[PDB]
């Protein structure tokens, strides 16, 4: 009994970066059962600093959804070629990647 997660990764907004802050938002939805692991990569290196992931909640689609946030400095963000949010669900992983504008 399984449904794989849909994942959208948002980079920091221009407005947030101008305010000297940065947050990556990984929006996770449509999965079952309701447990996931979220791992973040800065280029290819694993990062846990500044990460907060919610406990999955049931949606009106009867499937689970969750969020993961990565907080970093604008300088950190701009120093990498990409960041990735990797969502592991029942042993398989859906990964999304974003890059500085």
């Amino acid at each position: 009994p399984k449904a794989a997660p849909s994942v959208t990764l948002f980079p920091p907004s221009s407005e947030e970066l101008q305010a000297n802050k940065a947050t990556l938002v990984c929006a996770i939805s449509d999965f079952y059962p309701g447990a996931v692991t979220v791992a973040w990569k800065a280029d290819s290196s694993p990062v846990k600093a500044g990460v907060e992931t919610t406990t999955p909640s049931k949606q009106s689609n009867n499937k689970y959804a969750a969020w993961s946030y990565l907080s970093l400095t604008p300088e950190q963000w701009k120093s990498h070629r990409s960041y990735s949010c990797q969502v592991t669900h029942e042993g398989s992983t859906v990964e999304k990647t974003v890059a500085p504008t």
């Binding site: 959208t8 948002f10 920091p12 907004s13 221009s14 407005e15 947030e16 305010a19 802050k21 947050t23 938002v25 929006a27 939805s29 907060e52 992931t53 919610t54 406990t55 909640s57 949606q59 959804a65 969020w67 946030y69 907080s71 504008t101």
Partner: protein, 99 residues
């Protein structure tokens, strides 16, 4: 009591798969709970994923809301998230435009 109203930032559509785009708002660094989020003053309800908040190490909360819309609606249909943080008597209506 001590309160802090949120900083709201757009999660721009760019985030598009098979003719559907995901867009949203990030409600950052507020205290205490709760915040509420609507879209287009309650006109947009379908396919909305909102909350729960995360408690950051700073002791402040953040929350997001993301909606999946048709990609054809972008730049035509305005998308505004309506964020209310009653504890600080703050409301923010953030327009979310394509990047």
């Amino acid at each position: 009591a001590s309160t802090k109203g949120p900083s709201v930032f757009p999660l721009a559509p760019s985030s598009t798969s098979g003719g559907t785009a995901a867009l949203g708002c990030l409600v950052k660094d507020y205290f205490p709970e709760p915040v509420t989020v609507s879209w287009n003053s309650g006109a947009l309800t379908s396919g909305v994923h909102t909350g729960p908040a995360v408690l950051q190490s700073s002791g402040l909360y953040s929350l997001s809301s993301v909606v999946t819309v048709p990609s054809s609606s972008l730049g035509t249909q305005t998308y505004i998230c309506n964020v209310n943080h009653k504890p600080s008597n703050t409301k923010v209506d953030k327009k979310v435009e394509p990047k």
